[PDB]
Amino acid sequence: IISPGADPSQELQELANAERSGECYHQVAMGQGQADLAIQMLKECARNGDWLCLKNLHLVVSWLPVLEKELNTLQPKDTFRLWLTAEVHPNFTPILLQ
Amino acid sequence: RQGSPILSFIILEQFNAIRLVQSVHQSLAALSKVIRGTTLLSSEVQKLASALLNQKCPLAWQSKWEGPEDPLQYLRGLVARALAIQNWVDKAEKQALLSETLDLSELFHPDTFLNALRQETARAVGRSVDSLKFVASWKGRLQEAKLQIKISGLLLEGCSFDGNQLSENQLDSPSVSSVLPCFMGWIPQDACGPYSPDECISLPVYTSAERDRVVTNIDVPCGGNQDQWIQCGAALFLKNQV
Amino acid sequence: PLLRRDLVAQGPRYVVQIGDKIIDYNEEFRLFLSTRNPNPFIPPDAAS
Amino acid sequence: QGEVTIREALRELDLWGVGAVFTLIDYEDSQSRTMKLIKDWKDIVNQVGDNRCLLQSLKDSPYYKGFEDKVSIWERKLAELDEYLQNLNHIQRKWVYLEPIFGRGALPKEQTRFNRVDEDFRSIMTDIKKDNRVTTLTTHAGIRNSLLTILDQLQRCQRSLNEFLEEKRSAFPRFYFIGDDDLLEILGQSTNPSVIQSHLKKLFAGINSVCFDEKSKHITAMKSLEGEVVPFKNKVPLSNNVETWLNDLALEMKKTLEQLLKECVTTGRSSQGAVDPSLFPSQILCLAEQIKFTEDVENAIKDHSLHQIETQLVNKLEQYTNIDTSSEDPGNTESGILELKLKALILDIIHNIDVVKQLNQIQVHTTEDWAWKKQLRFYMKSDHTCCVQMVDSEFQYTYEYQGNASKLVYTPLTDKCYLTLTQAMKMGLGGNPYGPAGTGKTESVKALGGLLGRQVLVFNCDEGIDVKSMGRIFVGLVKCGAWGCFDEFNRLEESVLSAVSMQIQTIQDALKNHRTVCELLGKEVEVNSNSGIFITMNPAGKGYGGRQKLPDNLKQLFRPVAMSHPDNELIAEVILYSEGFKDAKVLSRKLVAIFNLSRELLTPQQHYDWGLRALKTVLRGSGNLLRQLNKSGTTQNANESHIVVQALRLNTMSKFTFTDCTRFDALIKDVFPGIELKEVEYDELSAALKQVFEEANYEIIPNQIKKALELYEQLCQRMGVVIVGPSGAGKSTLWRMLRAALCKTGKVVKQYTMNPKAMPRYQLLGHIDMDTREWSDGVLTNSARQVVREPQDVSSWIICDGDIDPEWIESLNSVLDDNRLLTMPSGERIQFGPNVNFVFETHDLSCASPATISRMGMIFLSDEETDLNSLIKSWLRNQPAEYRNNLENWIGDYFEKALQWVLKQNDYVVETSLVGTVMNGLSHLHGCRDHDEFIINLIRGLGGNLNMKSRLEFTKEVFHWARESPPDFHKPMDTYYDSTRGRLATYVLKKPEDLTADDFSNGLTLPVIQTPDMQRGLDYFKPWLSSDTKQPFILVGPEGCGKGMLLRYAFSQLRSTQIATVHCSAQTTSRHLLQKLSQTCMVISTNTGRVYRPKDCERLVLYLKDINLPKLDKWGTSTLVAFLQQVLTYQGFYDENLEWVGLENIQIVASMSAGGRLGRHKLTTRFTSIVRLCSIDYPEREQLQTIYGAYLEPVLHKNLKNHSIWGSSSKIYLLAGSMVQVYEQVRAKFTVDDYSHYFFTPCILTQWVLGLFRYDLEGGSSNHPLDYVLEIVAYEARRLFRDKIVGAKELHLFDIILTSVFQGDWGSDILDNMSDSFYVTWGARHNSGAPGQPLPPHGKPLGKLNSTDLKDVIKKGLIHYGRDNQNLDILLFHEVLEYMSRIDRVLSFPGGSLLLAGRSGVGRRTITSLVSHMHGAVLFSPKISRGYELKQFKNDLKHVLQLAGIEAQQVVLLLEDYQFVHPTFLEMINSLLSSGEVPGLYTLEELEPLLLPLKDQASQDGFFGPVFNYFTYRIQQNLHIVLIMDSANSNFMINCESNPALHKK
């Protein structure tokens, strides 16, 4: 959860480097049009076993069902992780939060 | 604006104030009429009641005048001033305004009032108004200032004030600290101050604790130990509830 | 239309509305359904 | 007998015809050929313009008439000709570019496309090579369509090239910020000089123009705009591949600069001062001097503090200031330039002085001490490539040519700025200088790019530009190694930002780790290590307005800076000294004070600005003078002092209200006592201006002159200018007059007018189609291109006469910036010269961010400056003046106090600027024959605007003022002049004879009783309606007032004309009007552009039912009104596809509810002051007895006219007495406030009386008669009211009310208890009892049935329904009966629809299903699919409407809560109910097949004019709608209130 002045991207940058290498880590900032591609990124990196990070989810609140739906679907590989950035937004879906 | 310029300010205030009072009154008369009698809410009075129960007076009013967030606290202030003002005016028509002690709590645009003396002094002194500079002094009355003021009900937080010095506040002490009235006015640049340059420390004079905006800032007796006051975050708030 | 017994009589058998599609309602048909989240959602329209 | 003149004009016009011919010139190709082609186009077209405007000039003279027929020829032919002509040069110029291009890129399948065109072009071209003359070109056949098809082909080949153009932007990156339109010119015509010069600057920062070798093979040199000539060390090789030589120019320019520098520096390092002022460009001098500074210093500190070095510099400076006067002698020097290049260098020195001066106080220990590292340092590396360093950050220098553009004065703030920025660049981060408005932060970056020498692009972030569209722009920047500042990055779509942050992050990571290649949009882009990214944004301020909050993620990628406070007094003096003004330090201090003090002690107007931008200008304001004054006379003391103030009073005096104006002037005296005053001096213009007012027949008033004059130099001063005041202030006229006066001496004025709010955001600004990723213009974007092509000695003005929103306007920031530039989001950008001015006209700047306010100049008008007695005079001249004598005398004395009283009162129906009110008063007064009449007409004019009770106060006092109190004792309102008798006034009731069911046949044209009110509304209209006297106006009255009823009558009075209606709502928009208008109105072409004309009508009229409803943007302006605003003002509008279309003949009219209720939004003064208006109120209960008394008689006399109790015309009037009595009591006790839907109006009285037709009151038998007739009345009543009412207690309350009146007025319990009985369609005499598709006019008749009788009858229906649908164990009980009885009545009635609100499971749906089935009503409910869409729905609706409207079968359209997958549905229904139509539901072509059948039917039925309305009518009769909704549903209550029509209908 971000607060004003909070940026974890740098810590993660470092952890990506530290606990992994190889540029397996890939990332996406939410915005216009990204959502369709994010699915692919997710799908691909999940399948690969690489680390994927997604930012500013609070902006795109309507998405989330589609996302969480796909999350219950998607098949992990050991060493695959999902990293998520969110300002405080209500109406943010409880399912994924769970 | 009348021939004498200070007064011009106060008559202005008189008017603009009353204008607000009556805007408020109308936004009050409206909502006063739906509850007891026959009216249909417009989006206006629909927006009025939203203000009350959000506990924040309306952007409608706060656009006109930056007042306290609490709507009642707003009114009490608005009103108390309105009347005081009529008293100021009275003392002013008679050219008698200087002579009393005036708290700046009352004014909506107190800064502007201050800057209004700046004219009247230069009128008396026949000087380019850019030439003057402003100060106050607790250690007596300003000699070189053609006109002055006695300002009371100033108030302070974070440091304590005794004549000629400031001190540290102890735990017990209420955050709020009453301050002794000033003598204020306008005086030549490159003329001798009331205080030497280095002893006094400038402090803001905020409209409230929120302290969004400032009326002015005043130089005040350091008594050495400059940083501690700053870290103390000492500041002056002109008035509360007025 | 499915949740209501919104069935129309076509001779002996009963046909049912789904989108544009009209289907014979097989009388042995029963339905049940689930969700991971309490709400959302239902309208009072749907509660009944 | 002056027909002679016009005859003579025509003759020579005719002589011109044959005389017209061409300039044909040969040309060779890429595929070398030769063709004749046109030159001096503009010269030729001007002919057209001039002659055509001449024609229309002629049209206005009377003597025109006699020769009218010939005018039409020429009007037609020319109107058409300009169109043809205009097309052709586009065609030509496009071919010119594309043919070379289609020669080289020869894909034969693409060549087909183009070759066909080449062929097609050359083809008709030769018809003209052959036929040299022009007039022939209209004779050619199908040319219209030829031309138009061609252009479309050119559109399409362009699309093929799209793929290609980007590969050419990859091939060379500066292209990324240039328009395709231009690009292909350059691609195609690489060789062409004028192309080159006219398209070079826009490509390259520095170079206005270039020198050309006589051979035109090479280039020896380049020019700055300023004229500063620069040679090229190595000559330029022009080449066939554009990029191949371009790339070389860049590098040869760089090499030229590169060598040129060291040459210069090496002479300067040696003790001999370089002093090659003539040789070297001021760009290099400053630089070279600045390393001299650097080297000196580091050698300096070691040796000594070296105050001697300082003194050197003071002598250098001192030397230069003296030369400043030696640079005044040359003036406009022959073959000479750059004397102001001197002024440039001065400030470097002086910055240096104050730099060193501070260091000398520090007495710095070492060369590499920190306070020096602070300072901005230059070095010529041993590699001979310059480098510049601050602290531990250093950067190599790009050597981009900047040429001479003022650099901003260094200041403490800039230290911070620069350093934080350089540090950010060290961090590989962007830098975010933020602050308030007029800070200077945008310009800073720009100048730091200059000092560092990179090429800097400016951007304006608006319009939520596509992430993709940003992407490319980045892609462009990166390759160029340019510096991209965005001005107002803030104002951007939050979803964009976040995605873009990802773009940024990846790029930074490349710069930091020095990756050669960067990946973005799936593209690998070789990225320049020398790139820079910055953003200059105001905070998301309380004041600032519409700008989107930034994600924290994104923030981190920048290093912020606080630019909030900028030292001015420093900057102030500096500039004066750069001018060489001597008392700099003294005066600078004064100005700053004057500002700060003005700001301190003057009324804090919204519109005032004492920000920096204002100040910056005053300084040029003097530099202009000082530049003039030395030439005219030789220099002296008192002047210099004296001069600044003039330069100041320019910016100043506009804004000031008289009070403030005086207060300011007095202030200046104090700080500048000796100076006194010097007024505006210039009369040359005022003369021309004075002339125009006389020629326009406007009265000459001094202030107008002042403000216009004032306005003039204000325009010279700054790019953008504003005019503020209420409507009728005169502000629009003001500027219009100016151009005319000006134009007489002043070569040109080009006028383009956006009402920005009227049209959508994109229409104005222009946009990127998301799919094609193709640009499509906006109006002003287009207009910009029109003005840039325009010649150097022309004035161009863009007017925005509309309300202001930071979201749209702030998009001109780069344009009105110190920097004059307009930015497309495609990257294309459009600088302007001093040719261009911009103008805004507006009601007020409430919504203005300060940014915009300070961004531009401004003028102010008040009521104080508005002169009324002065304006009335012009009204008097407008009158014939046969009575004008009388009027001057009457009005002079009478008007004023009557006016006053109303202003005192300030109790009135709608906000109108004075003018607005006045005018209403005046427009009613024309033609007034007697004094007696004038009195009435006066009051008429004004009392339109008063809330009713205060009307009386007025009228009354008017007779106190007038001679006599009015003839009417009571209701003196009612007093009407007698035109023939001259008998003053009273009002009369007029009983009509003819009344029967026939008169009441229709839903509309309902026979209307003519009580006094009527004759008042009509009398208060009619002047404004008829012919010559025409005005646009409004009616205000609460719904059910009668407005609709009255107007309908009023229109019918007029013989000339047709009546186009609109039923409005929030969703109502301009295009709805386009089309509703287009249906009944012409589409034609004339001189002065296309126009819409009324078809087969002498006049046309637009009636708009409710103006309030169209939605206001957040800023509070409906675009719909804004449209209408534009229309009245500029008799026209911008067609989509950017055509401007006029409107030749339409009165515009509206109705509306008083603004009381929720969401009936109120309308800007701008519009309201423009038009006339008036108000009416429900007739008094006394009058309502009379309506219905007379509306009642026919229904009773149709049957049983004799029967004892009936007839008895007093007993009839009684009914009216009681219902009206019921009416009141129920409105008193029940209101909107209890429940949204509690809507009661006389409409309901009507619905109640006329509802009685349906009941079989025959009483063929002798009647009770009370209990028969009255239970009916009761039952109807009960059905209209009680059904509607919610609460048990409230129903109980209602019943009381009802019972009371009935008992009191007739017997006691003639109600009794009739709970067992239901009156229903099922069971009526005459055996009505399914077939019967067309409904009775007053609906299916109704008879009286028992409960037990009925219970059978329902099961009869249930049985027979069981055959068609599923059978159901549905039980019966009283409520069910009640439910169904109530529905039957509704569904029998034509247009009758329901709204069934209740809790689920007590089905509206099961009962409704049946009734309709039993009616034989066709019953539709949409099948809902995952593909729920607007497409489904449109189809469905279309289908339903088709049925009820064409087939005429009665149809139930049914909907439940679940069906509304999209909020819009309801607005359609909402519209459908009210109007029987829906906008953008049918397209025009679709109608032809649909309504063809009805064309006869309608004519047989008897209707006149447009069929669609018939369609509509038909719909409304046989189409019934039903809606089931749940009280519990959250938005239930919402929607009801959202869609007013819903509970009204």
Ligand SMILES: Nc1ncnc2c1ncn2[C@@H]1O[C@H](COP(=O)(O)OP(=O)(O)OP(=O)(O)O)[C@@H](O)[C@H]1O
């Ligand atoms: N010099 C003049 N003498 C007499 N009447 C004038 C003069 N100039 C303008 N008028 C009249 O004054 C009225 C108002 O002027 P104007 O139309 O400029 O106001 P405006 O700027 O258009 O306000 P808005 O743009 O809000 O409508 C018009 O009816 C116009 O005909």
Ligand SMILES: Nc1ncnc2c1ncn2[C@@H]1O[C@H](COP(=O)(O)OP(=O)(O)O)[C@@H](O)[C@H]1O
């Ligand atoms: N002078 C009148 N004569 C007859 N009916 C009237 C008169 N005035 C009002 N009414 C009744 O009041 C209603 C006025 O409605 P109308 O004017 O058509 O709509 P609106 O009031 O919304 O513009 C009508 O239904 C009409 O029967």
Ligand SMILES: Nc1ncnc2c1ncn2[C@@H]1O[C@H](COP(=O)(O)OP(=O)(O)O)[C@@H](O)[C@H]1O
């Ligand atoms: N009189 C009745 N006897 C038996 N069942 C009834 C009766 N009225 C309603 N129902 C039940 O409710 C259903 C009809 O509900 P419906 O009219 O669809 O509710 P709604 O219109 O509020 O959505 C019937 O199919 C039946 O199951």
Ligand SMILES: [Mg+2]
């Ligand atoms: Mg800027």
Ligand SMILES: [Mg+2]
């Ligand atoms: Mg105007």
